[PDB]
Design an enzyme around this catalytic site. Structure first.
Site, mmCIF file in Angstrom:
data_model
loop_
_atom_site.group_PDB
_atom_site.id
_atom_site.type_symbol
_atom_site.label_atom_id
_atom_site.label_comp_id
_atom_site.label_asym_id
_atom_site.label_seq_id
_atom_site.Cartn_x
_atom_site.Cartn_y
_atom_site.Cartn_z
ATOM 1 N N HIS A 122 -6.676 2.102 -11.567
ATOM 2 C CA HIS A 122 -7.870 1.312 -11.359
ATOM 3 C C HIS A 122 -8.920 2.057 -10.536
ATOM 4 O O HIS A 122 -10.055 1.616 -10.531
ATOM 5 C CB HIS A 122 -7.540 -0.052 -10.688
ATOM 6 C CG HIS A 122 -7.253 -0.154 -9.194
ATOM 7 N ND1 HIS A 122 -6.073 -0.320 -8.638
ATOM 8 C CD2 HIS A 122 -8.177 -0.107 -8.164
ATOM 9 C CE1 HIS A 122 -6.214 -0.383 -7.341
ATOM 10 N NE2 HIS A 122 -7.485 -0.248 -7.064
ATOM 11 N N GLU A 160 -7.424 16.196 5.035
ATOM 12 C CA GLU A 160 -8.395 15.329 5.656
ATOM 13 C C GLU A 160 -7.737 14.426 6.682
ATOM 14 O O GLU A 160 -6.605 13.990 6.496
ATOM 15 C CB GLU A 160 -9.103 14.507 4.548
ATOM 16 C CG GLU A 160 -10.188 13.541 4.967
ATOM 17 C CD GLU A 160 -11.323 14.284 5.622
ATOM 18 O OE1 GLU A 160 -11.198 14.672 6.774
ATOM 19 O OE2 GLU A 160 -12.331 14.493 4.967
ATOM 20 N N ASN A 191 -10.366 12.900 9.626
ATOM 21 C CA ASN A 191 -11.491 12.092 10.059
ATOM 22 C C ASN A 191 -12.481 12.241 8.944
ATOM 23 O O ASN A 191 -12.949 13.365 8.766
ATOM 24 C CB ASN A 191 -12.127 12.631 11.325
ATOM 25 C CG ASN A 191 -13.306 11.807 11.800
ATOM 26 O OD1 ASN A 191 -14.344 11.708 11.150
ATOM 27 N ND2 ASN A 191 -13.171 11.178 12.954
ATOM 28 N N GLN A 229 -16.216 13.742 9.996
ATOM 29 C CA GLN A 229 -16.321 14.906 10.884
ATOM 30 C C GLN A 229 -15.432 16.050 10.430
ATOM 31 O O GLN A 229 -14.249 15.797 10.190
ATOM 32 C CB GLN A 229 -15.914 14.473 12.286
ATOM 33 C CG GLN A 229 -15.949 15.478 13.432
ATOM 34 C CD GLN A 229 -15.132 14.992 14.629
ATOM 35 O OE1 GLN A 229 -14.121 15.602 14.988
ATOM 36 N NE2 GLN A 229 -15.519 13.880 15.268
ATOM 37 N N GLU A 280 -10.061 20.873 6.020
ATOM 38 C CA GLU A 280 -10.233 20.287 4.691
ATOM 39 C C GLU A 280 -10.380 21.241 3.513
ATOM 40 O O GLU A 280 -11.004 22.300 3.670
ATOM 41 C CB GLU A 280 -11.451 19.377 4.602
ATOM 42 C CG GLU A 280 -11.495 18.289 5.632
ATOM 43 C CD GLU A 280 -12.159 18.697 6.954
ATOM 44 O OE1 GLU A 280 -12.257 19.864 7.361
ATOM 45 O OE2 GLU A 280 -12.602 17.800 7.615
ATOM 46 N N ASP A 323 -0.374 0.647 -13.199
ATOM 47 C CA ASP A 323 -1.507 1.116 -12.421
ATOM 48 C C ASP A 323 -1.223 2.460 -11.783
ATOM 49 O O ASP A 323 -0.886 2.562 -10.600
ATOM 50 C CB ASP A 323 -1.856 0.061 -11.368
ATOM 51 C CG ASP A 323 -3.238 0.143 -10.715
ATOM 52 O OD1 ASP A 323 -4.045 1.015 -11.017
ATOM 53 O OD2 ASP A 323 -3.519 -0.709 -9.882
ATOM 54 N N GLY A 375 -9.839 0.355 -0.498
ATOM 55 C CA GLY A 375 -10.045 1.745 -0.063
ATOM 56 C C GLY A 375 -8.716 2.446 0.192
ATOM 57 O O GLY A 375 -8.667 3.650 0.310
ATOM 58 N N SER A 422 -6.083 1.691 -1.949
ATOM 59 C CA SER A 422 -5.676 1.803 -3.345
ATOM 60 C C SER A 422 -5.394 3.167 -3.882
ATOM 61 O O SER A 422 -6.224 4.033 -3.727
ATOM 62 C CB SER A 422 -6.704 1.299 -4.288
ATOM 63 O OG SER A 422 -6.911 -0.064 -4.071
ATOM 64 N N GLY A 423 -4.281 3.412 -4.534
ATOM 65 C CA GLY A 423 -4.020 4.719 -5.051
ATOM 66 C C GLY A 423 -3.275 5.522 -4.006
ATOM 67 O O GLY A 423 -2.708 6.561 -4.366
#
Ligand code: 0QN
Ligand code: CA
Length: 240
Positions: free
Chosen positions: A45, A59, A61, A64, A69, A93, A186, A188-189
């Site tokens: 989704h 990742e 923060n 910042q 990253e 899903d 947010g 999700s996944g």
């Protein structure tokens, strides 16, 4: 994550941020688990709109530079052939994203350990949810990675009247439901990491919460049960 606490920097190094493009900038839309140096598992989704996505690994923060990253484009999305946008409660899903390049592993970027096929955890098994989603129902995105201890609610209790009823299928894992802690939009996944023989492995891909809000008593967060999809996962990586 509602009712969570911040995570250590290198604590869950197979967590990724799935972001889409807004203008010149990029906004976090979902989580995901790095499974291969060029493959991410996330929810289907999350890639239902035809957006430009990218993946960020290492990742911590969102707002910042951490010094850690790596940012790579999404080259190909293979979502589950039985997934239907109009019905998350049917299940399926799950999606796999081929990255444009192989990310480099170091103490910040590691591969997620997947369960063996068929593996079902016992009720009240110790699991952790991780993510940058809403900290309150209708609240805002965490800027640092959050985590909450979210114990599983097995299938028999999760699909009883009082909890999710028929909405949850056996291809799903429930966890939480105390009314204090949960995953939320947010997240999700993202992963549900569960400790199995001294190894945290990824047993869930966050899929949905109740319509009345994130942390709701007896509506545990519902996750795609990764162990029901190990052969399709494997059969997609061998194809592409
Ligand atoms: C599924 C995602 C779009 C969304 N997921 C999340 O919030 C997640 F992070 F917890 F994974 C969601 O559950 N949003 C809530 C507001 C929602 O729409 N929930 C919902 C639950 C069940 C059903 C039903 F019954 F059709 F399955 C429909 C929507
Ligand atoms: Ca950052």
């Amino acid at each position: 994550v509602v009712g969570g606490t911040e995570a250590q920097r290198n604590s869950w190094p197979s967590q990724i941020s799935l972001q889409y493009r807004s203008g010149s900038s990029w906004a976090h839309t979902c989580g995901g688990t790095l499974i291969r140096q060029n493959w991410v598992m996330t929810a289907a989704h999350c890639v239902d709109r035809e957006l430009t996505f990218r993946v960020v690994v290492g990742e911590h923060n969102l707002n910042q530079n951490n010094g850690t990253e790596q940012y790579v484009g999404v080259q190909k999305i293979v979502v589950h052939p039985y997934w239907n946008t109009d019905d998350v409660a049917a299940g399926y899903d799950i999606a796999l994203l081929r990255l444009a390049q192989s990310v480099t592993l170091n103490s910040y970027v590691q591969l997620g350990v997947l369960p063996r096929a068929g593996t079902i955890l016992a009720n009240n098994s110790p699991c952790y949810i991780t993510g940058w989603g809403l900290t309150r129902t209708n609240g805002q995105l965490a800027q640092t990675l959050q985590q909450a201890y979210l114990p599983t609610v097995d299938y028999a209790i999760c699909s009883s009247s009082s909890y999710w009823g028929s909405t949850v299928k056996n291809s799903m894992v429930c966890a939480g439901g105390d009314g204090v802690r949960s995953g939320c939009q947010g997240d999700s996944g993202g992963p549900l990491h569960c400790l199995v023989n001294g190894q945290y492995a990824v047993h869930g891909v966050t899929s949905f919460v109740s319509r009345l809000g994130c942390n709701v008593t007896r509506k545990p967060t519902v996750f795609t049960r990764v162990s029901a999809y190990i052969s399709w996962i494997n059969n997609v990586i061998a194809s592409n």
